[PDB]
């Protein structure tokens, strides 16, 4: 896959992702907050088409992510991120994708997600999150 | 608890 | 170095 | 004066400023690093002219500021920042402006300056610095 | 307050 | 169960825990680093006996935890931490306990675990981790 | 002088120092907070006597230092810390010592002092402070 | 990277 790394910002305003109910997460893009103003991150795109897009527009700064969860599993012999769920202090967004394989959960008791990095081929291969106070 | 990240800030130096 | 550092959790998925 | 707040970034690439030996600092503008790319901060400029321009270009990421020092004093009835000096692990930039009035010094043993905020009227009224690892 | 803060991840288990 | 909160330290020197291959994690205790010297954390004990002890002695500071994983599941109608594994940059310690239930994983790409909090009744009910650079 | 380094803690409960109204700061000691309990820092002592002790007992955690200021200057051919003042959100402690030489000031807009390091011979030669959120 | 937590340090004020 093509590795990506948005780096760190001051918060999250919107997440734009895409998924396929037969496979996994495809595209991933984030509108960050950068010192009180939106900062449009680069669209990290799948090598293929056929995904269903979704827009997660957060009521920044009163609304913020408190937990990211999902599933990883084999798709055509590749370990990929099959589903994602974003839980905020106001609402649960998801699950998006296929909730099959091995679950993972990142609850945040104190702090904030301020950035994403990972790799996307036909699907989201892996991802990591930057955390800050 | 807000969605805005914080940082240490030192100062100000100047008019107070 | 002159580059600010941040905690990073992950990766989840392949590799 | 007009308050300003650039916020916090990944590091510092360039500092542009101006001064007049009879008065004080008259311009302040920073080119930050934002996850590897230069981010041109807003130009915080004096309401007046006749200043000597200075461009401090840092050899980012190897070169970084280890001390900010300067002097404050009364100019035309206002307490302002009369002089600034920026010491890096490579060399000393300044003093820019007269070394007179009340000194201040911010040496850094560990960590980095990642942002500036302050106020500018006819001159730089005051300033603060964001610090981070 | 005068109490230092740190990033906290979790909890995992009950709740 | 009885809630505990060790708070934050400079690093981790040793983890002393207990487990029972038919139930879950019992005891949990940590020897932290505090500014270069050990700091022995409070022993958080199970209300029940019959556990198997284990000592995870780390080669502090060159050896540090890069992933904490395990399983959560039901024991006598209580949701508890049934198994734990600690992966460092030098060795893997575990799994300790029963590898049954729902998995969880906390890999760390940058940063360190500097403290633990949670609750222990008859077994380790839940836990959280303090992370720092 | 003899260098010292207390390291980093959770906050400050008390500062015990000594000074001489003709020379400079002598002894320096801190009672830190460590995760909700007092942690008695080592008393860093001058190699000479004749100082006046002061106890700065902070109403922790509601009271915390917001500015540290002082003076540095020559005493018997050595550059030392001649005076110190601690301003909290509740009151001002000091100046202690001799308010002569070069002033310095560290105001904090956001964050806390969580540790001290420095060196003491006949007098406090120099000092630095650990800062955290 | 090592197993020792880092903190911002400002100073020194005084000699050197």
Curated annotation (Swiss-Prot), chains A, D, F, G:
MF (Gene Ontology): carbohydrate binding; IgA binding
Pfam families named in the record: Jacalin (PF01419)
Entries under InterPro entries matching the protein: Jacalin-like_lectin_dom, Jacalin-like_lectin_dom_plant, Jacalin-like_lectin_dom_sf
Keyword annotations from UniProtKB, A to Z: Glycoprotein, IgA-binding protein, Lectin, Repeat
SMART domains assigned to the protein according to its UniProt record, in alphabetical order: Jacalin (SM00915)
Residue ranges constituting the Jacalin-type lectin domain according to the UniProt record: 1-133
CDD domains (alphabetical): Jacalin
Glycan attachment points: 43, 74
Family statement drawn from the similarity comment of this UniProt entry: Belongs to the jacalin lectin family.
Protein name stated in the entry: Agglutinin alpha chain
From Swiss-Prot, chains B, H:
Protein origin, superkingdom: Eukaryota
Protein family: Belongs to the jacalin lectin family.
Gene Ontology MF: a single term: IgA binding
Complex formation: Tetramer of four alpha chains associated with two or four beta chains.
Species per Swiss-Prot/TrEMBL record: Artocarpus integer
Record key words, sorted: IgA-binding protein, Lectin
Function: D-galactose-specific lectin, binds the T-antigen structure Gal-beta1,3-GalNAc (Thomsen-Friedenreich-antigen-specific lectin). Potent and selective stimulant of distinct T- and B-cell functions. Shows a unique ability to specifically recognize IgA-1 from human serum.
Designated name of the protein: Agglutinin beta-4 chain
Residues of the full protein shown: 3 to 18 of 20
